[PDB]
């Protein structure tokens, strides 16, 4: 039983004394401010626990309790989302008419004329239209009343209180020892089996006993207050067997392995529900039940306390071949002694999963009536692309913090890390060449087209009409997925998504999903994507690989992860740190994700979204202009940015005037950021000197001597306002555009 | 839909076979622990029969799928 | 690009390009007379300023002339 | 090469000499400060211009001053 | 077994001995290429490289150039290749002027005379190889299309 | 005094971070040091190497690379026995550091002060005063 | 009341957040009871 | 390129390390070790009642009959070809790992 619970009791005293002493956590900051730099250095380094403490135990304790604090905030956030749905929303009116009522769960106070924001969202209601997709979640959950939304809100508040108690309790009363945190086999067994496996299984149970009966009655057309309460399905097994006759047999088919009996509610239909335009919830129930089984199975792989299981160290040390030296030896020690190495992996994977979520949810719309709510489809795609891109760049941020700090060459001799660092010139030169090739052969095709169209030579352009760059591999994969039902997925009845080909699914005369054809414009913008992702990898990988040393600076690890430069010598070493590649790679992430959401927005409006009428033909939002106009930059400028900015500019005096104001406000913040990005600290300190002089003249100089921001903080402030401004402009542009027309 | 059959002694036979198959396999391949009377305990027995109900359930469903039953 | 990204990032890339040229067969037959280096700190400010300024002029001149021509009013 | 100067305000703390990454600086005997020593710049052809010496210097205005000048292979820190 | 080692027994040189870099297959190809093959004058090295490069140059200009849909497509493509070859020869000449001091050695590529020899061979071979491709494309209808004559 | 070219080199598997053609045609730097152990250190140019017990020898392209290794070898392995050489392609080996047997941060007799200015930094001459004149701004 | 908790509430960010929330709050209230004051009424 | 046999030529995978690529034995065993299981038939429209190797081997000949014409996008040749080679490359990779490394 070497996997055991070990706790120090009453480690840290619950006292308000350190609250009154800002900066108590570091030796530099605890002696108080003398310049204004102290104030900024206080906020900058506060959650950098491994910069304050030497011991991995105290660092692990601070992290565990801070994760409870984060959970408490998320539960509070969720509880408020339910309460605004319960109290300030048109949810009940939306349940009766999901295709007519626009979801709204935010009402403004009348103060300075701002009550114009309470627009007519429908259902005898005035409020701010919400695009987070909660209404579609709640109907998928089977909520059907505001009373149940109040109970969910209380359930979030109780959980929110319990997490903040646990964070206090596990830091101040019962803090686990380092040997508790260093149980990677136990944690993985429980997080696969217990968290993910029982998470899916329990949710499958809710889906089967609550979501499936309630949503069958809704899609049959029964009024929400005419629907039995969710526990009457749990007790009256006769009533549940009316909707799904397999329930007449109970749990004998489950235990005797006669699973085919359960095909009423555990289907493999594929495609969409014609009534709601969403995934069949009988499929999602089977999906979560099947996922639950193999998460519970996966969580029995590793060895804890009984000899059965794998040692993760043994798996890693055995995988070594003739190209890779000692192989994965020493990686277990890295990943059970470095939190940053763990955070680097988990941020890159969570960011990747968030990017996948964006693609899977628009193409295979999971919730009822979310596919034809186009403001939600655009909002949750754009939101989850940004979460993914940010989290991916923090994976390289913390891979750099690992390499600078937690990397020890003595324990990493001739293994995979040692070998990567020892040919990093070959990696970075090959990536650099790919990015030049990719930029020339993706963006240069656009420049070729701008010139040819401007020169009157439309026969010389790369277009469907002219020279054709077809995406044959993507078209071929689309062919296979339409052929899969009955052929390579024989028991499936419909395709995984109608985006691959097949029918047009219409709900309330609006397209839910329909085949997303790929042409020359799709070939061009996909290689635009591969170029922007590869350059982002190039900037971030070069920062991780050269974080400790270069040919330029032989001792970059002694300067740290985050330093501004090593002087104007060697020609100039401005922005040479690993932090400065995260800084430069967040711009190229911003560039990458901006083109992705622009590609998504224009393609869905031009080729997918719109209205169906007689003869079954579809009138799209921008009328199919993507194919012949997304091949030039002038087409993107004119037919996408200029044409679709009309709604946000003409929004003044409407309920969308808030988006019009945020459009201008974010344009401001973006431009203001360039003051911090294009300027240097030395100018601003000398300007402050004259301002200090005028204060000295009036005897009003401060005792905390004002300083210009650090070189790094000028970069961090410039990047933050650039991101706030750039993303905030697109947020207003996307939301005012798609609320008006979709 | 893949045909499955109500529990019969044939279903039992496959399950029994699979459980025993894994009990013998577990005596051979479990690396950390009288062919079955050395070092055999409950976590070894509870693991081999857990894989038997995984292998047996898969075998039963597959043999029902193809017609062997 | 010249105003936001500064020298240290670019000098370290250029060192990986110098390595690759020397190690690539049939290409290391050709040698630079001047060692390739990243632009200086002051020079990049001047290059970015020129590009910023040139882009500013060409955009407005294209706008002020074409919008007036197109409208005639 | 770069030009590195030491002014007679040097308190002989040796910090510039310890911070120099290229062994440009050394300590010579003096009698103008309490420490009996002053910084010296005998090997400025090896100065890369990092100005780590200037950062290390604690006198109010720097006793050691680097003046960036003509660039060489050594002062451009080129390993190629 | 280990496939990666230091380059030519030297652990501190800026290169590695990898299978792409130093396999028997790689060594063979490099040693037998005209630039590195033994027993070749620099002029002959230029001719073989020139014939190779000039021959393939004709095709992209012919198939994708401005006059591609005209009946003067092959003429325009050859002259476009000839113009590139002439521009490239100027590049070769100026490289020799600025890169090599004048010495009697002429059997090496990296000499003033040896580069001038190689440049002479490359221009003759490039025009020769481009001319050969012109003759073949002019006469054979398979090459004029992409093989599309068969369908 | 002179570099014994036969000193064994630390066990290293190679890297792309080592020296290039400019080392074999312009100048190369070498560092030697004594190790009491057969222990792993970090190369300035890349990954990790193992220094052999006894005398080690490396070759690097930059003088700063040899001293960055010297700093690390003295801060984590307490080796103060390091000698840095400059090597020209003519075969000439030029001893560099420590230049007179004593470290620069320690005073030594017979060191002549170079670069020393008799006044403080504020007493320099204005640029206008020395315009079209060869006179130096340091007084 | 605890003196260390009162010393915490006297910290610059809390007072800045409280004072400017209080300041913002009586501008908001003044514009509720007395709205649309483009001019000093005279 | 070229194939090296199990018997000792002077071929070196890198600068100084000779290494016997077992291109006859690995390629033969990987081919047979992938083709024979792949003979397993399936009454699926892509296979057509044959196995993956045999439906694929059938689709080489049908498209070879129309020799100048390429197979179409919806033609089963491409899917069969991709799946067959994916398993074949994997068995070749795993076969080279198994034979060269474990030597038995
Ligand atoms: C977590 C997410 C969240 C978010 C973003 C919102 C957002 C909003 N809510 Mg909702 N709400 C939430 C959770 C949330 N709520 C929860 C969990 C509940 C259940 C209790 C409610 C219950 C609720 C009601 C009942 C109402 C709102 C209302 C509102 C709106 C105005 C709030 C306002 O100005 O009051 C401002 C109130 C103040 C007292 C001002 C306080 C300002 C202080 C100075 C902030 C300082 C914080 C402090 C310094 C932190 C440090 C502590 C200190 C010791 C140093 C706004 C849209 C109102 C609305 O929609 O009206 C139409 C409304 O009536 N909310
Ligand atoms: C079955 C066991 C189990 C489960 C469910 C969890 C669950 C969790 N652990 Mg893990 N953990 C476990 C065992 C388990 N742990 C063991 C054995 C160890 C020791 C090796 C650890 C060590 C560990 C560390 C070091 C950390 C976690 C963290 C977390 C949280 C991850 C963030 C997240 O997704 O939360 C959101 C998802 C939720 C579902 C929220 C649920 C909140 C409760 C606690 C879940 C369980 C409730 C209860 C069992 C359900 C009752 C059902 C009943 C109604 C029928 C999550 C609550 C991290 C964290 O955030 O710390 C707080 C973290 O840093 N765990
Ligand atoms: C700043 C972070 C942030 C914020 C504010 C949001 C906000 C939102 N998300 Mg997103 N999300 C994020 C990060 C974020 N997301 C990340 C990082 C992921 C990747 C794991 C996702 C994946 C995700 C999914 C898959 C869904 C949302 C949805 C939603 C919306 C409803 C919120 C809700 O009740 O969840 C409700 C969430 C659900 C009902 C289903 C969640 C199912 C997932 C698979 C649970 C996974 C939990 C597990 C512990 C995580 C493991 C991670 C893995 C790498 C190991 C809202 C717009 C929902 C939406 O768009 O509805 C319209 C939705 O279905 N989110
Ligand atoms: C953690 C998830 C969870 C939970 C708490 C429950 C809980 C329950 N299920 Mg559900 N169920 C689940 C997942 C879950 N189920 C899943 C994943 C499936 C798919 C295999 C089912 C399929 C299922 C069926 C088909 C039936 C239940 C039934 C029941 C009830 C058990 C009554 C009983 O023993 O007699 C069961 C009857 C016998 C003859 C034995 C109970 C309310 C039964 C019930 O009461 O229906 C409402 C019932 O008939 N469940
Ligand atoms: C699970 C996620 C996670 C976690 C736990 C951490 C944790 C950490 N990171 Mg990492 N990071 C992450 C994600 C994460 N990061 C992501 C997604 C990125 C990409 C942007 C980074 C990029 C990154 C860098 C580049 C650095 C860190 C650093 C740090 C450490 C110091 C934190 C601190 O003191 O900041 C204190 C927190 C603040 C000062 C907050 C201010 C930040 C912004 C500007 C405010 C937020 C704006 C807001 C959302 C919108 C405002 C609305 C507007 C309209 C008003 C800590 C170890 C630093 C370090 O040195 O680590 C050793 C460091 O240099 N991280
Ligand atoms: C429009 C603005 C713009 C443009 C064109 C570039 C261009 C480039 N950046 Mg920069 N960058 C920018 C803004 C921009 N950046 C900004 C704002 C930042 C701030 C954070 C950066 C930060 C940044 C970093 C950190 C990195 C880059 C990289 C790159 C290169 C990508 C490789 C490539 O595509 O090669 C192809 C070249 C192009 C697409 C340029 C346009 C050429 C087109 C096709 C026309 C060519 C015409 C032709 C030459 C005319 C010849 C005749 C004429 C002379 C008369 C390329 C040189 C990366 C790099 O250098 O790695 C490879 C890299 O690491 N950039
Ligand atoms: C005698 C034993 C036996 C037999 C005849 C089968 C036969 C079958 N199994 Mg089963 N299986 C077995 C043992 C057996 N299995 C065991 C021991 C396990 C381990 C638990 C599994 C786990 C298993 C899973 C998890 C699944 C199957 C599935 C299948 C079927 C389709 C596989 C296919 O063509 O996908 C071809 C797909 C490709 C991607 C290949 C290209 C096939 C009839 C699958 C199925 O569809 O069942 C309905 C399925 O999901 N089997
Ligand atoms: C695809 C076919 C295949 C598979 C699965 C294996 C698998 C195995 N071989 Mg074999 N081998 C093969 C073809 C294959 N070999 C061929 C064609 C030859 C002749 C040239 C050999 C010759 C050979 C020898 C001489 C030896 C092995 C040995 C081994 C075992 C461990 C070493 C190894 O290769 O690691 C492979 C590791 C695994 C397969 C398990 C890891 C699990 C992951 C998921 C790998 C999956 C890879 C891939 C996706 C599976 C593809 C299957 C198919 C679709 C192509 C392992 C059971 C050794 C052994 O243990 O002796 C019995 C041994 O001595 N093999
Ligand atoms: C993800 C894991 C992974 C991958 C991708 C590889 C990939 C490779 N290994 Mg490695 N290897 C691995 C894991 C892996 N190995 C592990 C875990 C072990 C320990 C058991 C080994 C032990 C090992 C040995 C001992 C050898 C290899 C060899 C090879 C090569 C196979 C030959 C080939 O490409 O034929 C396929 C050819 C084609 C597809 C032609 C395409 C045209 C290839 C580079 C062999 C090699 O280098 O041969 C040259 C070799 O001798 N590996
Ligand atoms: C304007 C500017 C300054 C001057 C800006 C300073 C000194 C900060 C002024 C901030 C004031 C004092 C407080 C900020 C309050 C803001 C109104 C709200 C900020 C939001 C959070 C900080 C709360 C620099 O110091 C600088 C340094 C390096 C590169 C570029 C620049 C730069 O561009
Ligand atoms: S001080 Fe500023 S300009 Fe000078 S090197 Fe550092 S970052 Fe560059
Ligand atoms: S600038 Fe750098 S190299 Fe030059 S003397 Fe100062 S510290 Fe030494």
Author numbering:
A (entry chain A): 11 to 189, 192 to 754
B (entry chain K): 10 to 42, 51 to 86
C (entry chain B): 661 to 733
D (entry chain C): 2 to 81
E (entry chain L): 2 to 152
F (entry chain D): 3 to 141
G (entry chain J): 1 to 42
H (entry chain O): 22 to 125
Excerpt from the paper describing this PDB structure:
Photosynthetic cryptophytes are eukaryotic algae that utilize membrane-embedded chlorophyll a/c binding proteins (CACs) and lumen-localized phycobiliproteins (PBPs) as their light-harvesting antennae. Here, we solved four structures of cryptophyte PSI-CAC complexes purified from Rhodomonas salina (Rs) cells grown at L- and S-phase. We then solved four structures of PSI-CAC complexes purified from cells in both growth phases, containing either 14 or 11 CACs, and termed them as PSI-14CACL-phase and PSI-11CACL-phase for L-phase models, and PSI-14CACS-phase and PSI-11CACS-phase for S-phase models. Comparison of the four structures reveals how cryptophytes adjust their PSI antennae in response to the different growth state.
Two PSI-14CAC structures closely resemble each other, containing 14 CAC subunits which encircle the core complex. The 14 CACs were named CAC-a to CAC-n in a clockwise direction when looked at the lumenal side. Except CAC-a and CAC–h, all CACs are grouped as four heterotrimers. One subunit (termed chain-s) contains one transmembrane helix and binds three Chl a, two Chl c2 and three α-carotene molecules. Chain-s is sandwiched by the inner CAC-a/b/c and the outer CAC-l/m/n, and forms multiple hydrogen bond interactions with CAC-a/b/l/m and PsaF. Based on our high-quality cryo-EM map and transcriptome sequencing results, we determined the identity of the lumen-localized protein, which is an uncharacterized yet highly conserved protein in cryptophytes. The final overall resolutions of maps of R. salina PSI-14CACL-phase, PSI-11CACL-phase, PSI-14CACS-phase, PSI-11CACS-phase are 2.7 Å, 3.0 Å, 2.9 Å and 3.3 Å, respectively.
